[PDB]
């Protein structure tokens, strides 16, 4: 028969700090046992203080990211303001639930700055349910990346975050996850959102 879905891999990560946010991803696009591209990032700039990351089925990612931008422009024209991170999350929840009986096969994470200038991270499921967190990883290697963040950021099972420490931690966790996950790692794209705007960075991983 006809199957409307495929799995294209990908890992996304977000960390919220005192006065910043970081969203990171990998740039490999795959299908089955083949590699389509090595230069396909998964982070999209929504606003000068809001970034979104998507992973999963690629066609749904493209169409969803176009819909979100159209809705943001509609809101700005009707209300004469730029939409807020909380409003973006609340609208994305409704958009995702609109397709309840033919779901989007996407995992979404939203990072940015709230109205008092502090970092904010929201995580979604393919159907719409969202939650505000302090750090969150999604995609293929979420189960490998989450315990490290729980240990190092949350100080679990042990007797503030700087920007540099968060950068080192993100690089380390992706370097470690490139070793064991089949679907992950050709290059690493990092987006830092702060008071001055959005900055970008790239790092090199394994190639095999």
């Amino acid at each position: 028969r006809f199957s409307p879905y495929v799995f294209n891999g990908g890992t996304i990560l977000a960390i919220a700090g005192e006065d910043f946010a970081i969203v990171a991803s990998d740039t490999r696009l795959s299908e089955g046992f083949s590699i389509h591209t090595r230069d396909s990032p998964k982070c999209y700039k929504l606003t000068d203080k809001t970034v979104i990351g998507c992973s999963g089925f690629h066609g749904d990612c493209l169409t969803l990211t176009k819909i979100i931008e159209a809705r943001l422009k509609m809101y700005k024209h009707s209300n004469n303001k730029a939409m807020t991170t909380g409003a973006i999350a609340a609208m994305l929840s409704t958009i995702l639930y609109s397709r309840r009986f033919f779901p989007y096969y996407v995992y979404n994470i939203i990072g940015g700055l709230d109205e008092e200038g502090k970092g904010a991270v929201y995580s979604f499921d393919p159907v719409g349910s969202y939650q505000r967190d302090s750090f969150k990883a999604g995609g293929s290697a979420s189960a490998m990346l989450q315990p490290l963040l729980d240990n190092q950021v949350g100080f679990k099972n042990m007797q503030p975050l700087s920007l540099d420490r968060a950068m080192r931690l993100v690089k380390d966790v992706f370097i470690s996850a490139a070793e064991r996950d089949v679907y992950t790692g050709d290059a690493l794209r990092i987006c830092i959102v702060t008071k001055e705007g959005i900055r970008e960075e790239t790092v090199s991983l394994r190639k095999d």
């Binding site: 190092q152 099972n157 042990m158 080192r168 380390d172 070793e179 991983l205 394994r206 190639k207």
Partner: peptide, 19 residues
């Protein structure tokens, strides 16, 4: 053809961390 990247942080667990 491939090599593992160098670790940046130091996550060594000091003695007395586990109950």
């Amino acid at each position: 053809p491939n090599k593992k990247g160098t670790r940046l942080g130091r996550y060594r667990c000091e003695k007395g961390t586990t109950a």
